[PDB]
């Protein structure tokens, strides 16, 4: 990534083995919704070369990788539309050297090709976690004697995976109480969970 | 490797050493061992590259194929480039560490570390292609999910390196009829 050294200058540094293994193990263990911010955090200040390295180090999940590739193609083709200066293929790191990527990011004013390319990856990863969401929010009903805590945990976890905002707010106020067990008959979420011990 | 201080040579780190030996031990020659090598060899001299390959125990079939690939690339470098570094100097065999550092730190530089890493990554891609267990032509989908089939398809395609044709051609008649009627996102949502 690009990091400021003790001397106070923005310089490039090799992506660390701790960051590489952390990303590989997060992908192996979890495309859950919480893998998105874990990728953004591990890719902090990363150059498109480092982002490409993080994605290439992912073994398996090649359907998601290919859907991620096709999303990058769409966003890169959209960047070339808007910008007929780094072209879309340069932001993706395929037609740009590491020196050119550093020059765009360290420029004053900067062209953060690292954050533009990360934006396309995060977008494609959101399409992957939306696709791999197993259950719908409509199919989430409180179990027989399932605690209200565990039901709410499964509700918003399914809601988080199935990402519009007018839909989420309306599904929260309506479907949550509507799909609870009748014992529902019984406000903030803290009051709602304290009321259903 | 050669790193910039607050450009100077630095000993290859034990963390880098152990991570490389463990990634080869765990993932052998899967496709994702290529970028891991490139990232761990970041800024590496030809001496540090030789060290990473020499610390690899076993897999000596791949090690030999990697050597013969380096010989072809070094012989090709001597053909195009008849002190300017010869192919053996780039491989680190006929060059001292001071010589390799002098080439990499030159202005303008001769990145013998990135030229020798190019030859290594090239031979590694051949190795991963050889170590692909199945061929893409032998990758067909009864009740296997279309997700798992696409995963195996592009995993075999990534290692082997008619994508759009063979993918719909080898699906089961359930998904093959839908795909033939019709992006991979649309293709997977159409066979869910």
């Amino acid at each position: 990534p690009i990091v400021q050294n003790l001397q106070g200058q923005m310089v490039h540094q090799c992506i660390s083995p701790r960051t590489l293994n952390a990303w590989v193990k997060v992908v192996e263990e979890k495309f859950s919704p919480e893998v998105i911010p874990m990728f953004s955090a591990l890719s902090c200040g990363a150059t498109p070369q480092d982002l490409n390295t993080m994605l290439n180090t992912v073994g398996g999940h090649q359907a998601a990788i290919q859907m991620l590739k096709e999303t990058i193609n769409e966003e890169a083709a959209e960047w070339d539309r808007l910008h007929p200066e780094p072209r879309g293929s340069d932001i993706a790191g395929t037609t740009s050297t590491l020196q050119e990527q550093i020059g765009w990011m360290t420029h004053n004013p900067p062209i953060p090709v690292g954050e533009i390319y990360k934006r396309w990856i995060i977008l494609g990863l959101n399409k992957i976690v939306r696709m791999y969401s197993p259950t719908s929010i409509l199919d989430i009903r409180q179990g027989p004697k399932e605690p209200f805590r565990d039901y709410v945990d499964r509700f918003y976890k399914t809601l988080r995976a199935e990402q519009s905002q007018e839909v989420k707010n309306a599904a929260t106020e309506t479907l949550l109480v509507q799909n609870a067990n009748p014992d529902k008959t019984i406000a903030t979420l803290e009051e709602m969970m304290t009321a259903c011990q | 490797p050669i790193v910039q201080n607050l450009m100077v040579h630095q000993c290859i780190s034990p963390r880098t050493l152990n991570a490389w030996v463990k990634v080869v031990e765990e993932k052998a020659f899967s496709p994702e061992v290529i970028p891991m090598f490139s990232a761990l060899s970041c800024g590496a001299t030809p001496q540090d590259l030789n060290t990473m390959l020499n610390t690899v125990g076993g897999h000596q079939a791949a090690i030999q194929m990697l050597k013969e690939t380096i010989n072809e690339e070094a012989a090709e470098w001597d053909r195009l480039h008849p002190r300017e570094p010869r192919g053996s100097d780039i491989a680190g065999t006929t060059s001292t560490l001071q010589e390799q550092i002098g080439w990499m730190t030159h202005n303008p530089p001769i990145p013998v570390g990135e030229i020798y890493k190019r030859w290594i990554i090239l031979g590694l891609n051949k190795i991963v292609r050889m170590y692909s267990p199945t061929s893409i032509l032998d990758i067909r989908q009864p009740k296997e999910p279309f997700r798992d089939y696409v995963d195996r398809f592009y995993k075999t395609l990534r290692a082997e390196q008619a994508t759009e044709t063979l993918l719909v051609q080898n699906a089961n008649p359930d998904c093959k009829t839908i795909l033939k009627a019709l992006t991979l996102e649309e293709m997977m949502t159409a066979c869910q």
Partner: peptide, 14 residues
């Protein structure tokens, strides 16, 4: 296609 099937992220085209 900026990225091709089977080719790695960061792959120089042609």
């Amino acid at each position: 296609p900026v990225l091709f099937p089977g080719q790695p992220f960061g792959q120089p085209p042609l």
